[PDB]
Design an enzyme around this catalytic site. Structure first.
Site, mmCIF file in Angstrom:
data_model
loop_
_atom_site.group_PDB
_atom_site.id
_atom_site.type_symbol
_atom_site.label_atom_id
_atom_site.label_comp_id
_atom_site.label_asym_id
_atom_site.label_seq_id
_atom_site.Cartn_x
_atom_site.Cartn_y
_atom_site.Cartn_z
ATOM 1 N N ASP A 65 -61.125 -24.675 27.008
ATOM 2 C CA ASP A 65 -60.797 -25.812 26.162
ATOM 3 C C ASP A 65 -59.405 -26.375 26.424
ATOM 4 O OD1 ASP A 65 -60.490 -27.683 24.270
ATOM 5 O OD2 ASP A 65 -61.049 -26.412 22.578
ATOM 6 N N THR A 66 -59.317 -27.365 27.311
ATOM 7 C CA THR A 66 -58.013 -27.924 27.662
ATOM 8 C C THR A 66 -57.330 -28.651 26.513
ATOM 9 O OG1 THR A 66 -59.007 -29.951 28.592
ATOM 10 C CG2 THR A 66 -58.590 -28.120 30.110
ATOM 11 N N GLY A 67 -58.090 -28.988 25.474
ATOM 12 C CA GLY A 67 -57.533 -29.632 24.299
ATOM 13 C C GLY A 67 -56.966 -28.668 23.280
HETATM 14 C C1 LIG Z 1 -70.056 -33.638 18.365
HETATM 15 N N1 LIG Z 1 -69.159 -34.243 19.363
HETATM 16 C C2 LIG Z 1 -67.874 -33.917 19.310
HETATM 17 N N2 LIG Z 1 -66.915 -34.549 19.985
HETATM 18 C C3 LIG Z 1 -65.761 -33.946 19.678
HETATM 19 C C4 LIG Z 1 -64.507 -34.219 20.046
HETATM 20 C C5 LIG Z 1 -63.456 -33.418 19.613
HETATM 21 C C6 LIG Z 1 -63.746 -32.353 18.773
HETATM 22 S S1 LIG Z 1 -62.498 -31.249 18.277
HETATM 23 O O1 LIG Z 1 -61.171 -31.959 18.305
HETATM 24 O O2 LIG Z 1 -62.838 -30.679 16.916
HETATM 25 N N3 LIG Z 1 -62.400 -29.973 19.320
HETATM 26 C C7 LIG Z 1 -63.645 -29.204 19.461
HETATM 27 C C8 LIG Z 1 -63.346 -27.729 19.764
HETATM 28 C C9 LIG Z 1 -62.414 -27.129 18.701
HETATM 29 C C10 LIG Z 1 -64.651 -26.926 19.788
HETATM 30 C C11 LIG Z 1 -61.732 -30.317 20.582
HETATM 31 C C12 LIG Z 1 -60.494 -29.449 20.737
HETATM 32 O O3 LIG Z 1 -60.020 -29.473 22.089
HETATM 33 C C13 LIG Z 1 -59.390 -29.820 19.737
HETATM 34 C C14 LIG Z 1 -58.766 -31.192 20.051
HETATM 35 C C15 LIG Z 1 -57.709 -31.454 19.149
HETATM 36 C C16 LIG Z 1 -56.389 -31.504 19.598
HETATM 37 C C17 LIG Z 1 -55.372 -31.881 18.726
HETATM 38 C C18 LIG Z 1 -55.623 -31.993 17.364
HETATM 39 C C19 LIG Z 1 -56.934 -31.970 16.906
HETATM 40 C C20 LIG Z 1 -57.969 -31.697 17.801
HETATM 41 N N4 LIG Z 1 -58.340 -28.814 19.851
HETATM 42 C C21 LIG Z 1 -58.000 -27.983 18.872
HETATM 43 O O4 LIG Z 1 -58.580 -27.975 17.778
HETATM 44 O O5 LIG Z 1 -56.931 -27.191 19.147
HETATM 45 C C22 LIG Z 1 -56.390 -26.398 18.094
HETATM 46 C C23 LIG Z 1 -56.132 -25.024 18.672
HETATM 47 O O6 LIG Z 1 -54.968 -25.210 19.523
HETATM 48 C C24 LIG Z 1 -54.113 -26.179 18.885
HETATM 49 O O7 LIG Z 1 -53.789 -27.196 19.869
HETATM 50 C C25 LIG Z 1 -54.506 -28.401 19.524
HETATM 51 C C26 LIG Z 1 -54.761 -28.333 18.022
HETATM 52 O O8 LIG Z 1 -53.584 -28.766 17.332
HETATM 53 C C27 LIG Z 1 -53.822 -29.162 15.975
HETATM 54 C C28 LIG Z 1 -52.616 -29.990 15.511
HETATM 55 C C29 LIG Z 1 -52.882 -30.697 14.179
HETATM 56 F F1 LIG Z 1 -52.924 -29.772 13.165
HETATM 57 F F2 LIG Z 1 -54.072 -31.403 14.181
HETATM 58 F F3 LIG Z 1 -51.856 -31.592 13.945
HETATM 59 C C30 LIG Z 1 -54.959 -26.844 17.796
HETATM 60 C C31 LIG Z 1 -65.056 -32.166 18.357
HETATM 61 C C32 LIG Z 1 -66.025 -32.953 18.814
HETATM 62 O O9 LIG Z 1 -67.367 -32.940 18.588
#
Ligand SMILES: CNc1nc2ccc(S(=O)(=O)N(CC(C)C)C[C@@H](O)[C@H](Cc3ccccc3)NC(=O)O[C@H]3CO[C@H]4OC[C@H](OCCC(F)(F)F)[C@H]43)cc2o1
Ligand SMILES: [Cl-]
Ligand SMILES: [Cl-]
Ligand SMILES: [Cl-]
EC number: 3.4.23.16
Lengths: 99, 99
Positions: free
Chosen positions: A25-27
């Site tokens: 998960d690069t996000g």
């Molecule tokens: C049906 N189709 C569909 N399309 C979709 C498209 C997307 C999503 S999604 O986003 O739920 N998600 C799914 C995944 C988790 C399975 C993607 C994910 O890579 C998410 C992206 C992101 C990055 C930044 C903020 C919010 C989300 N990352 C994430 O959660 O990271 C967490 C753990 O690490 C930290 O760093 C980042 C974030 O910080 C939070 C900071 C604040 F708290 F938000 F400020 C924290 C679901 C979808 O469903």
């Protein structure tokens, strides 16, 4: 390997003596796994994503193996709907995005 | 390009003639952008993440440039914490994970 993105990029990880499936998960900044036991110290943390925050336990210096690739890093444990391998460990196995 | 993961993989996108920053997110099935205007009719969708679910507006067949690469596809708009480019568009620009 070269991993296609036509499907979710799921891999098997070995952690804490257990085998689990997780998403590359690069996000995700951080690696977050569903409830499980890990040894050693931990501290509470809130992490946020789409839909808001969850409380997790932060364990540091945890050994993991992903695709034969050993690494060590921080693992957050709590009520995530799916296991994600975040950048903190993806870097250690030399994972890059390419296009 | 080859993008390492020591920092967030933030790129510039262009959509509706405007530049935005977005995260290349292999953990996201779909592409979700913060509130903005897009043309045409939209359909409802619920998408789930770490903290639960949000309601978004689904727009189809939207032109979008990602790091200069041209795509045309589905864009979801709603209260996401960050703009994310998911696999629906990462596949259009030929993106893979490699290690
Ligand atoms: C049906 N189709 C569909 N399309 C979709 C498209 C997307 C999503 S999604 O986003 O739920 N998600 C799914 C995944 C988790 C399975 C993607 C994910 O890579 C998410 C992206 C992101 C990055 C930044 C903020 C919010 C989300 N990352 C994430 O959660 O990271 C967490 C753990 O690490 C930290 O760093 C980042 C974030 O910080 C939070 C900071 C604040 F708290 F938000 F400020 C924290 C679901 C979808 O469903
Ligand atoms: Cl770490
Ligand atoms: Cl490197
Ligand atoms: Cl699409």
């Amino acid at each position: 390997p070269q991993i296609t993105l036509w499907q979710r990029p799921l891999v098997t990880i070995k952690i804490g003596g257990q085998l689990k499936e997780a998403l590359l998960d690069t996000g995700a900044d951080d690696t977050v796994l569903e409830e499980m036991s890990l040894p050693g110290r931990w501290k509470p943390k809130m992490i946020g994503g789409i839909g808001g925050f969850i409380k997790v336990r932060q364990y540091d210096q945890i050994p993991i193996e992903i695709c034969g690739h050993k690494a060590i890093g921080t693992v957050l444990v709590g009520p995530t709907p799916t296991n994600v391998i975040g950048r903190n460990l993806l870097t250690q196995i030399g994972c890059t995005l390419n296009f």
